Design a protein around this ligand. Structure first.
Ligand SMILES: Cc1cc2nc3c(=O)[nH]c(=O)nc-3n(C[C@H](O)[C@H](O)[C@H](O)COP(=O)(O)O)c2cc1C
Ligand SMILES: OC[C@H]1O[C@H](O)[C@H](O)[C@@H](O)[C@@H]1O
Length: 147
């Protein structure tokens, strides 16, 4: 199957997670295109993939990264019925609205008809060894839902 991952990372923590998850998926008989939100992908591309993984840190007052805002708006016009999806991100418990960008992106995927097949994966700041193993389990469990 053909998969897409779109991630946002300012300081590198969510990108570390993205690279682990994608590297695990690449050891299966599936292809994945990993795209940084800074490179301005259009949301319509999500319609062309069998599975979708989004990654995002949380910013400001429990908001999406600034660079995700246009893409998020454009998601109101796409049809994701049938697709398998999941979301991850790095987080900081110095903030009350912890990792809520993950929850916001999950909600939007649900609204557009995607089957969200995993709980959101939240890691505190830079992954430690146990967090890295959680990234491996996320990728392995995601693939199981593909046909
Ligand atoms: C201005 C600012 C606001 C933030 N607001 C939140 C927040 O509401 N909730 C949260 O979990 N983290 C918040 N964070 C923490 C980042 O999401 C966290 O540092 C994360 O590791 C960044 O991921 P990245 O390395 O991929 O950029 C905020 C960080 C900054 C700098
Ligand atoms: O493409 C836009 C439309 O897509 C779907 O029909 C949504 O359910 C609807 O809320 C939205 O207006």
């Amino acid at each position: 199957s053909k998969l897409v991952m779109i991630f946002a990372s300012m300081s590198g923590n969510t990108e570390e997670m993205a690279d682990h998850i994608a590297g695990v998926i690449r050891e299966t008989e599936n292809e994945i295109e990993v795209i940084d939100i800074m490179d301005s992908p259009e949301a319509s591309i999500l319609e062309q993939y069998d599975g979708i993984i989004l990654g995002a840190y949380t910013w400001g007052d429990g908001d999406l990264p600034d660079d995700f805002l246009d893409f998020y708006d454009a998601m109101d016009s796409i049809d994701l019925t049938g697709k398998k999806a999941a979301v991850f991100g790095s987080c900081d418990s110095a903030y009350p609205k912890y990792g809520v960008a993950v929850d916001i992106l999950i909600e939007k995927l649900q609204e557009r008809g995607a089957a969200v097949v995993l709980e959101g994966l939240k890691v505190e700041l830079t992954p430690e060894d146990e967090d890295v193993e959680k990234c491996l389990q996320f990728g392995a469990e995601f693939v199981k839902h593909l046909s």
